[PDB]
Design a protein around this ligand. Structure first.
Ligand SMILES: [Cl-]
Ligand SMILES: [Cl-]
Ligand SMILES: [Mg+2]
Ligand SMILES: [Mg+2]
Lengths: 251, 251, 251, 251
């Protein structure tokens, strides 16, 4: 308990599923949290469901929106004081092979999944370096950052990019003594309402040729590894990849 | 707090350095612990330094000793009840290139670092499967399981072996619904009394071309990732590698 | 000899350095080659230096230019018949950390290094599937696709993207029986006239803490692995990463 | 043609399947070859099938036999002159999970697959260093060196060991300017008479959930990457992993 004492976290895509579980456990461990999402309806309800505005607030933002990133860091500092912790969790999927990806689909997915993580990482380093915060940037980088999927071409590109860009940022922050760590988290298949809304999706993901455990994960599985990485417990972990996938990548 | 409620852990090489830190944090999180080591003098003192014999005990054992593994699981069950958690941390180093490794050095190091982890993993699966324990085997597998070191040839062999053997065991346990997870932890350079006893060793390990953070870790850095992996917080993590190395492998 | 009998290859950035060496060895092994580059002065001289217009031609192209990719495949087919082989070699570097990367630098580098490899791979699959050509797409994906560099943030993002996007494409082509393979090549540091023009670059690259061989490579080092991947010798290799780096990533 | 001009190669387990194909292509490319195997009936027939005793000979040897390794290098030097090239191909498999592996099975498999590769690599470095031979050690390290298989526990241990031990040897040889390269080759599933003798093996290996190409490879698939690694074409490749697996590890 109090594993995130004094921390101030931004969690992009924090209004549902994995992001909301990360936000929930972060508040339970003593962090102040600003969650982001595209929809005020979802986001204001989500913040209130977790805690008071002294614990957690919502900021409406598309991660692809560069100017919005400045507003987001300014709003979080105004509410909670200097930001110590950034979880770049916002992402979209296109269910196309490379061959069948349109240029419009390619640009839209990279704008959220890659540009957004770049904008957040770049700004996070500038705003959180050299303040003795034990600062931590956690980039969501998928099992699709390790292995290909024939029907997730653009998503694979974005997650590979996040995986190695995060190492670059980890190294620069370490070498310059910035007191900022950067790591990637790689979820396998996770049961969310969105999976539950697609008939047969969980059953397909639970086949042993996909997930050896024969079931898929829950959002708290990703929340717990994020608490470790945001905490000072992980002060020697930087430039690392943390996989939580039911054995998906082990075979 | 109470993150290892009800757990019963064996930690090999648990009498000093990283193993002792893992044992200390495991007891602090509510686990019963049996630590092993070659020397009764070190081991009985270490157990008493951490807690009462109702919390932690010592069992004298060389991990290379196959028959001793049976005695160790029997003694732990007699003291604390069924074992839920095994940390295979016992290991030795030979400071020779492959070229300059004698056959006697090769066999001695593999007996501890590889045979020992095999004997512990094999027995752990048999003893901890199908009991609803949330069982977890944590194999120590080094940054030397990912990258070569020209003067650690046999050690590199042993750590590569542990890395991939652990995936095999993770997959079999997952596919057979055994309720046993197997993961590897990969420390970079860690400050211990043994490092402190070698003049200039910490300074060499802290050079940026080795450890980008410009310093080395402390035993608690490895203890915290082991608490996560032993706990039910990591119930969807199996067959994964967890690196805590100050950026060593990121460059 | 004749290891690329009947092959028709496009090599982007084929007018200089690594691309020119690949083109030279491809023509030697019996391939017909279209090389691309931004500058017709360089490109027309380069094609004539290697062979006759029945062996090798130049097509002026920026790999970021989507419409130009269509014209490039059309021109290659007109000159040499159906394309069997694509080497996505064109690339640029920005020598900035993630922190210091401007948005204009980010967008410019991703346009060439990521968008261009996507446009080439997508069009390559569409044009070379189901023609019994033994088709092969070779993506240049850098050692910077495996490890971070603190001063190559955008470059690392682009090379990690190419690494995993290529696996996606490899799998879709294999599962659909397209007779198209996709693989990545990961050069370490290679001596080119351009490296010769950067004072101290080769010397810095040649430090044992960077390249263990204590020297950097030459363009033919990359040409020879590309001949293997373009040829039918590699008909069971798809979704693989081929590193030629002097030991850079082994430590 | 003549890609292995002047080379003198030892190929362990060179009398059947993959080893025999490597030997066949090595002789075709101008190498002198000593093949090893346990059975003189098979070995003498295999050598005569490929070439004359001035091109290729057989030496009876179990790779687990340390004293026999000395006699093998002595016999090869006597027949062909100084050895330039070693392919550590000899291997055995036990079809047991870690849980089900007997100690006798463990020790027997490690004696061949790990001890034998150590004995060969160590002796190879000692005999081929500092002779200007362009020396090359190629270690067979399996897709089972990258991913687990629930029913290949000891095999996975041995192949992970070879993978990382080879990086250690590569680095020491590079740093000491020995003119010795060390690399690993990782075959996927390969059709051999031995696979043909296991009912349903090829069919199981050919499922898209195992090999995405929907078929397995042939021995020449491994021979061609070994020619590249033995030749001076690969003079900048050391400490690298070369996977030829039909897409097995890409998903
Ligand atoms: Cl040009
Ligand atoms: Cl034989
Ligand atoms: Mg490195
Ligand atoms: Mg896989």
């Amino acid at each position: 308990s109090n594993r995130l004492d004094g921390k101030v976290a931004i969690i992009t895509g924090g209004t549902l599923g994995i992001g909301l579980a990360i936000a929930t456990k972060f508040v339970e461990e003593g962090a102040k949290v600003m969650i982001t999402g595209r929809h005020s309806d979802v986001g204001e309800k989500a913040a209130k469901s977790v805690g008071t505005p002294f614990q957690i607030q919502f900021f409406q933002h598309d991660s692809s929106d560069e100017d919005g990133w400045t507003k987001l860091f300014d709003a979080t500092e105004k509410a909670f004081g200097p930001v110590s912790t950034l979880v770049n969790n916002a992402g979209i999927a296109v269910n196309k092979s490379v061959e069948e990806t349109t240029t419009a689909e390619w640009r839209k997915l990279l704008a959220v999944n890659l540009d957004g993580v770049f904008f957040g990482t770049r700004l996070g380093i500038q705003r959180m370096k050299n303040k003795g915060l034990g600062a931590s940037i956690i980039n969501m980088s998928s099992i699709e950052g390790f292995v290909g999927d024939p029907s997730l071409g653009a998503y694979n590109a974005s997650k590979g990019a996040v995986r190695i860009m995060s190492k670059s940022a980890a190294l620069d922050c370490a070498l310059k003594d910035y007191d900022v760590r950067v790591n990637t988290v790689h979820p396998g298949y996770i049961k969310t309402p969105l999976v539950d809304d697609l008939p047969g999706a969980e059953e397909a993901m639970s086949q042993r040729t996909k997930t050896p455990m024969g079931h898929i994960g829950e959002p708290n599985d990703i929340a717990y590894i994020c608490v470790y990485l945001a905490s000072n417990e992980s002060k020697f972990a930087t430039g690392s990849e943390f996989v939580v996938d039911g054995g998906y990548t082990a075979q």
